[model samples]
Target chain A: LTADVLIYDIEDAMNHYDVRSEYTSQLGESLAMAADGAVLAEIAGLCNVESKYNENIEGLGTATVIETTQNKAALTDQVALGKEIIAALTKARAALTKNYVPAADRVFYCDPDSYSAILAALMPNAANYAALIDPEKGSIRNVMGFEVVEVPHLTAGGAGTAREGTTGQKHVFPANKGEGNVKVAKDNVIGLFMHRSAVGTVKLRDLALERARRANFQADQIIAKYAMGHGGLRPEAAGAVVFKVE
Target chain B: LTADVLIYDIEDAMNHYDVRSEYTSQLGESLAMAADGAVLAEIAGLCNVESKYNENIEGLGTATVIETTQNKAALTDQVALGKEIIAALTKARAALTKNYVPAADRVFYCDPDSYSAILAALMPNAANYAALIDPEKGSIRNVMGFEVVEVPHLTAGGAGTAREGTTGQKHVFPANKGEGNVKVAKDNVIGLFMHRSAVGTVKLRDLALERARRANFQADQIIAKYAMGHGGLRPEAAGAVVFKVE
Candidate 1:
């Protein structure tokens, strides 16, 4: 949706004579927002189902919404918010069709759980269905925050096993070096900081499985990815929430 | 410049009805080729200077060129071949606009580096000293093979220092459950994973300000980034030459 908007917006700006700064910035923001949805859905699904060692929402919180700002919300709030967010997303999908379809977009996506279970249980014989969508094993971008920590699984090249990364190397182009030069080279790549649902009680859920739209996700997938690695930076976000004590 | 021809060839395809393979494929191929250049520049620079330790090239033999089939060639032959390839690229940039300026159906691009770097960077920087144009970084796409890595970051909505993640007490959306279907009450609100780079030798040197363009030394940026744990994978062809002792 954002892609389609910016694509059109680029033209719109040109038509209006907005030039570089005006139109270029708009295009970049759209790309980021559009990419975010797909990412949010992917991570949450993986951690919840794949990690066999721990399962279930022992101290899991719920997803909900509020007409006003959140004060001291409870578990039920999460449930309502999830329902509303999903509902809003559904409407948003329909809204996209209301105007135009930019090439193709993802209307739906699978939760990483079912997406993975199929790969683990029925792969090889499944005609590689899972691999097609979750090609990198449900991997997606996680560029949100300030600090960055390189994981072992990530290979410097395309494949995960080709080679390992080296220790801290000195900067070849520290910003202070001179003019018109970018100092980002030697600096570490910052990982993203984002928000999504992480934990909750188990339940029968439905996710939009197929949407050509670039970014989309299922219930479990959305939460786990958000939870597995992190909940967020603020004091309000938590990783796990078990609905029932016993 | 001959370097930009890689892209022009594709544009030409668009013109000649692709008498070959349609302009789209040609264009795509051209992009891929430049990408290769960028990748090679990225890896060579990083490994040589950025990486804490360069991979041992002693028994590594010659690099295997994915671009072409080396017919039972000796290691020395292959080594010489690598030097020629780089030399050719260096020359390719010099050959464009040979004697005079281009015009009309004879010329199309206006924005410098807008279409090709070979053509764009043909002249020196206009106002200052170096006459070079800015090509979309994407232009460097197909020049070489590049590496990928992962970085984890902090989340946006979490609480407490003890949890290392969002604690239940600080959660925004609380957990909720019902008899048949349990529900999650809270969701994440932060984002992370901001940026990643592909360190290349030539590119690093160019960026580092450590050497001037066409200087005796370049690729300092690549080396610096690699030392920061930025790259992995080596090109079968370029890697051999790159790995050789200085």
Candidate 2:
């Protein structure tokens, strides 16, 4: 089930002005975040599709769908998860190579938990560990040959949502609209390893704002909209890692 | 040395008029052919560059430069050449797969000589011979999942030209302008097996015709020009077959 939060307004008498500038800025930030989350969710949904290849784990609700047991790991143990993540990356590299996907465009998009585990796993290894760390930015630069990107919006086990404690926050863009929308249990997914061409986005109209004054209500209405399309382009170049949720 | 052909005109009373339509059509055809040749030559030149992989046979004058003895065959015997060509195609496929080049866009560009051998080679096999032959069109279809394209302009070794009898016909476009212009004797190359992405062409200006009256010369000057650039995009996806001329 999806959950939403409600904020209560506390308008004080001394300073009760509607700051349009702050409101617009906050609205812009929210829109950008929602857009980012939607794109990631859509990509995750597409990558979750069932494939003929054994390397692709079908988005079945359980971890049993993952054919290769070696590719799966326990999420609870950070060390094991981290090691498995690296192994998964290597496996992904091989899969991409076998599929003839160019190495230059390969990417590894991980959720926060998996990203943390990867960092934790690499902490023990002194050799070549320094190359991964960017002390100036306090983050891992890259892993193997892939450019590692942390995406919070990628589905947790094909749930099409992210979870905080016990609450489930649905993706801003629903996964039910397109191909490869199959759902898996929240415990199964780790991250997506794919080439840049695996999925594509075409923008017809960029984010634009419209402002109109409502004479009767004595207020102004601001509307923001954008038009774009995104979907899987090359399924062979897209793959995911699975882990037992428990 | 480069050579040019001079055409002598027989100006008679009845055939004195210049046919602009025929002239334009012929000019267009010549321009297109030149462009095609240049693109193929540039691609071959780029693919000829030395690489780390042993699979890539450097464009050297002698067949000894070919590291894999099995990959090199004598050009005299059509049957043997055809079998070796098939082997080279298989090797190319493996190399491309290892490099992650997608199979969909793979192409095998062979010269007329190699094309003839390929047809002769397939003629002996009865099982799948019918599938390779297009009875209506009288041409061999796809081979080993690669689109078989006959490119007459591809370098015969690193000579950057094709030959007939003892005379060499230089490519309409010279190969000395950009990267990978190394020359090898004419007797080494067989064909280029590569993915479409291995080379790319960008057109800044499409072919156009210009006609201007030369009042002093009593003749109109017609010019056909086009602006474009071509080069290798991915060397790993491009490969060549080497053979001994004798």
Candidate 3:
């Protein structure tokens, strides 16, 4: 005698179940980090070659390399390492001037060692400490007209096979994360001084996430990939700083 | 006439008329200078390549290029040019240190322009002027731990053909002195900071003078030739300085 009783099945009750956004968000963050690393690795690799754009560009030549006077041992001595970092950056700035790159466009990308050294050098003085660091963000703003950025993924040196789409180029990892053949060592590249036009990236396809349901397995497969190219556009605007980590 | 029936004829009296020594001496001086130029040019060319000795050597890498902040325009401003020269040299010294080269073994070979700039820079201060220059010799003794030597034959950049013994190497002349194919321009290479062991010369045959009598032409052919090879032994120990000339 009761009215038609409404009953809810397990599938109907769980109709709002969806994991696409969560999986895609995680993949997006990872892809963004990996893309940055790839761009840096590619540009740094190209700086080893002689610049060929001097014919049309004024005040440019094949001089695009800088070697660090300090070694891994210097890292133990913070004050000395700090001075060395400043000196190297000064030289790098001068090099860019020689290349006719404007000061406003200059950027210095360094590893954690160099970043820490710079901080140690400046943090002692109250004036410098206040000017260099942001209390809220807790990051270094600039050094010697260069916008300082610390990248944990800067490449180092060792014997390894070249990456795909590169010729005789090696060492694109901070640690061994590539194919089984790539072995990473402690030949640290301290930093890189680059101009806005020094390098460029061409994205043929923006980063995308695709999902497909596996009907038989009752599962969804998530895929993330992008097509792009990165390289040194004007080597004259770029200079690499190499120092020993150990 | 009757006193000497065997009159001294022109050909007979010229028995001691040999000009071999005179010609050889002149040729020797010319060959010496040309040899120096060739050696400098060859070694400088080799510095542009990436060093391959890191497997056997310590603290060596592929950082061997430096660009001067000063250009041809700076030459007009002596004071500015002078400071720039010192700064560039300081960087060069640091580069050699990173290469693990000894201070005693380091030599800074500069073009006339750089030498003049250095002299101009030091001559302003009384103490520096007195210490840097030797009154008797009227030349700079040393600057910042580098035994500075002025060389007039540093290679530069321009569009031209490569030298015979080199692969794609160009600009071996400070002027147009090579075969008609090689055209010289004003892309000046300011200097080179090099270790003693940076380069080597292999002498297969030392300079020798050969005199041959041409019976058919009634002339003597004075030929001067030598066989030698000059190249970079360790690129890590060498650093090149480049600046614009025009």
Candidate 4:
């Protein structure tokens, strides 16, 4: 995957803001008013970065909060959301620095530990992320894999409830697990990105713990449901257990 | 949460893991009477994170490289073998650090996330993480919430191929979920560290990802499971799932 990003428009940059809109509204108004595709892409690109970095702070999970309050979940619909980001950054990066040759344009790592920080960078842009989801199963059906999913796989109806509970209480979520009316936030992100598969995660300590003993694997079964090799595999009730689709 | 490592004497550690005479052979002659619990915890922890992180990157569905190498097929007998690891390291960290500062005592934003880093730091000093593992489920059994198991609940039968494939090749974990070899790792440091209960997490991802959406709801579930009533009656199925002799 060469993953090269290219922006075709430039100039026409404007500092307009939408009086009615809070987060994306002001940006959207600004982008719409800007005649240059490059400029629009530039604004979008910067917005992407700003959204990502800011989201990293505590309590902010990929912008699921703000948009939902205003019902602007359609921002996450652009395809190649990842590529668009790369393209936006490509334009912005070239617009400023550049001048270096033989380098051929590349960002080696997201942080000090290696691995491209693509996920890290885009985590804040819920709209960008919303474009990349299914919304229903709450599972991230990405080819490379996804860390944050609508992680509903652990709940009762996600088809994967705990068969048992061991540890202490039954399944006490970490103190910070459920901190907001997340569904509403997801509503906004989903609406903005036009994604139907994006949802928040539900905790499942009891089931995970129950399935935790030796051989009492839980995630593996779900994983196996997909590992069996493509083409419509499901975790059907063969006898007593369940699984995922391949 | 702080992982207050349950420490033990190295001889006691060896007692847990020294199942076969070959254990001595495989582990070879002991360098000393005690081992570092932090070291053992680190090895097991890192090996686990390496495995899980790879899963996150490579997709556990079909490309599970982490599971392929663990001694999962061995009944918790093998992982429990690592019990000596806890014993050794507990003793070692205690002796080396002077105070009861077990090195397995680190906390993180995500327990599983930091697990591998911690383990990676400690692995070099310890033998193969295989040393600290119970050899039963190919994992440290219970940590946070989930314990490794072999039943169809979800996981490759440690008795079989938890995972097998060349790096970069099509990954495949020949999960014999129904085999039910379910056993905990010997050297595994399991149990509710915070003295919590199974009600905390029904999904592995929540614990694994460190982001839960149902902390309080799950907490309620936890209270229901083990709390015998906030002050009076047991929360319905409370003790039924994990406890017996009822």
Candidate 5:
């Protein structure tokens, strides 16, 4: 007497397998999602990682960081808000150009908050603005000259207190100390300008998912892993702008 | 009938290696050396590639571009030179620390000219210390809490001319102005300072060497290759100090 034997293919691993345990197909789907999910998560994380300030990186060729001043103007005044963005963009371009040659195809990154603020403040035209609010894409396709990339993960906290004096002489306790009005200032969101080569990422290990099958164990084992490293090559080539919305 | 068979091992292989080859032992060493040499050469080249101000790279992070000022004090005066170096170092550290978190271990890089100037200016004790002149190490092992890494490739060219301006009026040759002093200014050489994490490097292909041999032709052929990239992460993190020896 002879028994039937079968071999399995991973191509249809998530859906149908020739032979498997009760929860094998379910585990397969979970593992596949886990692998795919990792990629998205890592990429999203990089939106902030590449923008963070690192002491070793000068704000030169590819990567750049800058301290921002608070914009006293209100974002509701669309023209003033538009002016603020333009000024910030101009400064970034000037600083980057002064240090090194900029990339031909440059892109700017803004978080959802900044994007919304900008959109609310200004639009190219009332009818042509339909594409900016496209359901598929999160932010505007283009702004001014640079391609706009809306990074969902972009978040910047407040900086330290502003210094007004060198010595103990404080410019406070004025004769007209009206109502002792105190308000917690909102933190500005960080915007990024970059050339493609400014930041580089490499995968040390590609996605390796191995299925370890054993007769003794109740279930088959699915292990997935990958290794990667990313760094801003020309921190100076790119620039960071703070979006202050009032 | 008897047959001679030989088999060799490669550290790693991407896939399908039943192709062709012969005479393995000799090929291994050549391939190994080629791989190791790639690393050293890549690292050395990065010294210039990252630091050189290119139009593509914005000159951010550690590899920053700065128009240096000429040193009025002479390198022969130990105290003056030391003060100058310290001031530069302090400014660099201050700029970096103000913007970002510094790397734990700070290091400084200098060219041979700057190294020689520093050596000629200061000695550990004064009696012609041999360690400073050690055949292996060119300059002091450490100075001012920095581990110096001397690079032969640390050469930076001149920036544009410095300008002097008055309110609303540009200076031109007037009758009142006698003979104009037409003198060419000497450009200063750049020295570097940074936290270790300011720059990074990686190899995409790690020493991939393949051998194809033919016993009949009496030919052994080996092809070795590697791909790599390196860049300064923070131009702001690092600072450049000028050495105005001339």
Candidate 6:
């Protein structure tokens, strides 16, 4: 749900000449939040669907899995991480061929942890071994024959057991790339490399925005929603690498 | 595409005994054969799309392969063949589960070669070893929780490199089920065990039937055409087992 709150000064006193113009402007901005929220939520859903395979292909320790951390505690070496990333790309391609899936027009998605390490490995401290950083945006453009992409869904763990929770505690999220407190191999997906034809999108409904007013309160109720199911179409055409950190 | 054909008999001043209604019926049947051939050709194209994975998923000795009759071949032991069929079912289920594809509504298609041996094993000396067969149909109904199906596509080698043809080559197509010249493990497919989700059907156009005529020859030409595509949706969710006889 999206919301906006504003407390405007009254125009009752002699000093409060005219507040109508200011109040009118504030109302206009408040109304716009409903539409803004709709777009944001829809985009978020689109990003989250990218890593939905982790949950769909749920068996742990299966052949489809790539555990880069290998029971390690922390990721202190950058070159090792780079090698792991390369291995994952090879595995993804091999899996596609083995399973009879056509591997074409692939995409390599990165969780913040993977991106941070991979970037560090590339130098100029050049952001990656390939010098693939976009100079203007500082984002990775390509890696190992795939278009490099960073989506929050891979970091936050959608369709996953959200890193679990302890009693009397808050769940801490991984900070954005290059930041500290990263979990490189905590049984969650570090990244995905996939052929376009290997993924399927199940759209049950269209994205929608709705607004209503509370009966007794001067509040607006705005929400954005869409129904969707996303996962692998051909298991051979995709690969997931789950890694860890100390 | 489905079709039917028939021809009208010309009116003649033939009130003769043997030049009777029988003669009129024979001529009508001949006209219908042309239309029947068109439909058969169209349907054959549909069935052949199945094993097409042989050409599409080429590289026979590559990984993700299932070979029962390895090296020096020729079907000898019936019990060994039955065991392999059961093993294939188990492997198919494991692949689907590991790939995150739901294994519900699974189907195990038997190759004519495999089916011939399996059917023999079930009756003559009967050795499935694991108690897997439907006594009613005298055909296997369930093997490791998958429905047993023997479709002509497997025997005919739809998408596969057929197990025959050399010398004075005339590919002997089976006359439906339980017909002549059946080869279990003689090219075509040995078997396929897969989740329903792994296969996709492309229907670009609906099956259609139309009539045409030649100017000089007062004969009708029946026509049917359909453009379509079909293949595995998830390669990991399906399994192809190839075997040999001699």
In the range B1-246, model 2's lDDT, one tens digit per residue, is 011100001000011111110001011111112246345532221211111111211211111112132235434234433343333233332222221111222343322222212323322211112222222122232112212211223322213322221122222222211112112111111243211111000001011111211001111122311112111111111232211110
Name the candidate, 1 or 5, with the larger lDDT value: 1
Per-prediction DockQ: 0.01, 0.01, 0.01, 0.02, 0.01, 0.01
Cα lDDT of model 1 by residue, B97-177, tens digit = 111111111332221222222322312111111111111133364332111110111112122222213332122223221
Model 3's i-RMS, to one decimal, reads 30.9
State the TM-score for model 4. Answer: 0.17
Q: What's the TM-score, to 2 decimals, of chain B in model 2? A: 0.15
Q: What's the true lDDT of residue B10 in model 6?
A: 11
lDDT tens readout by residue for model 5, B101-146: 1222233332122122232332211111221233223223211111
Native interface contacts kept by each candidate, as a fraction: 0.00, 0.00, 0.00, 0.00, 0.00, 0.00
Global lDDT of model 5? 0.19
Minimum summed lDDT over a 10-residue window in model 4 chain B is located at B237-246
- Count of clashes in candidate 3: 0
- Model 2 bad stretches (over 4 Å): A1-86, A89-102, A106-182, A186-246, B1-246
For model 3, the superposed segments whose C-alpha errors exceed 4 Å read A1-106, A112-118, A122-246, B1-246
- Which residue ranges in model 6 land beyond 4 Å of their true spot? A1-126, A129-174, A177-246, B3-246
Chain A TM-score by candidate, in order: 0.15, 0.16, 0.16, 0.15, 0.16, 0.15
| lDDT digits (tens) for residues A33-130 of candidate 1 | 33455446333322222110111111122332232323344554454444444332332222211111111223321122211122123322111222
Off by over 4 Å in 4: A1-181, A184-246, B1-90, B93-246
Superposed by TM-score, candidate 2 places the C-alpha of residue A116 at a distance from the truth, in angstroms, of: 26
Q: Give me candidate 1's TM-score against the actual structure.
A: 0.18
lDDT by residue for model 3 over B130-158, one digit each (tens)?
Answer: 21112101111101111221112322212
